[PDB]
């Protein structure tokens, strides 16, 4: 009621988080205008 | 009168070596303390 | 300082200026424009070029 | 050294300008056009003629 507290700076408590993956390997990115996607992997073995 | 000051230090920042791996339960020649210091620094909430 | 003039220009599309996080619109904040009580424009919240949109 | 001027010119089709190895678009490497943060062009990944297709 008459304490008259004084506030100092409070902490922030950050989170240790660095992707390395959404910045290293996944450089490419695309949208989907369709319901699904297709992936092609054609092996080449000539005789 | 006793006056208490509790910063809120989470207890895992006050590790004791007790157990079977304090520091002397390892050979001086073979063991590497770098692993232990890294493990301790893992939970630091800031660059050490 | 390689040039005698330090002024350079950059166009801003109307889409590039909007309310941050697509929030609501207050009296002083309308579509990313911060104005005074009388309505004079004071500040702008320009969105960075989000291309690609990821 | 056969000429007083050693400078020549060559036009390039846009079909010769694209991402290397048909790589996906990125923030700065767009259509093989490496650009700075401000958007000004810095480099081009030009490809030779695809014909003949061997």
UniProtKB/Swiss-Prot annotation, chain A:
Q: Which family does it belong to?
A: Belongs to the lambda phage major capsid protein family.
Q: Which residues form the signal peptide?
A: none
What the protein does comes down to: Assembles to form an icosahedral capsid with a T=7 symmetry. The icosahedral capsid is about 60 nm in diameter and composed of 415 major capsid proteins. The assembly is primed by the interaction between capsid assembly protease and portal dodecamer, and major capsid proteins assemble cooperatively to form the procapsid with the help of capsid scaffolding protein. Major capsid protein forms hexons and pentons of the icosahedron. Viral genomic DNA is packaged into the procapsid through the portal vertex.
Subcellular localization: Virion; Host cytoplasm
Assembly description: Homomultimer. Interacts with FI protein.
Protein's name according to its UniProt entry: Major capsid protein
What species does this protein belong to? Escherichia phage lambda (Bacteriophage lambda)
From Swiss-Prot, chains C, D:
Q: How is it modified after translation?
A: Proteolytically cleaved by the viral protease during capsid maturation.
Protein name in UniProt:
Portal protein B
What is the role of the protein in this entry? Forms the portal vertex of the capsid. This portal plays critical roles in head assembly, genome packaging, neck/tail attachment, and genome ejection. The portal protein multimerizes as a single ring-shaped homododecamer arranged around a central channel. Binds to the terminase subunits to form the packaging machine.
Compartments in which it is found: Virion
Name the family. Belongs to the siphoviridae portal protein family.
* Subunit structure as annotated in this protein's UniProt entry: Homododecamer. Interacts with the terminase complex composed of two small and one large terminase subunits.
């Amino acid at each position: 009621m008459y304490t008259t507290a004084q506030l100092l700076a409070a902490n922030e408590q950050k989170f240790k988080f660095d992707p390395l993956f959404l910045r290293l390997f996944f450089r490419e990115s695309y949208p989907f205008t369709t319901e699904k996607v297709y992936l092609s992997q054609i092996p080449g073995l000539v005789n | 009168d006793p006056v208490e000051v509790d910063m809120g230090r989470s207890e895992e920042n006050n590790i004791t070596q007790s157990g079977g791996t304090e520091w002397s339960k390892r050979d001086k020649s073979t063991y590497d303390p770098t692993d232990d210091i890294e493990a301790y620094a893992l939970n630091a909430s800031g660059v050490v | 300082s390689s040039r005698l003039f330090r002024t350079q220009f950059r166009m801003v599309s109307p889409k590039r200026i909007s309310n941050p996080n697509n929030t609501g619109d207050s009296r002083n904040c309308r579509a990313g424009v911060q104005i005074n009580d009388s309505g004079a424009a004071l500040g702008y919240y320009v969105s960075e070029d989000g291309y690609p949109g990821w």
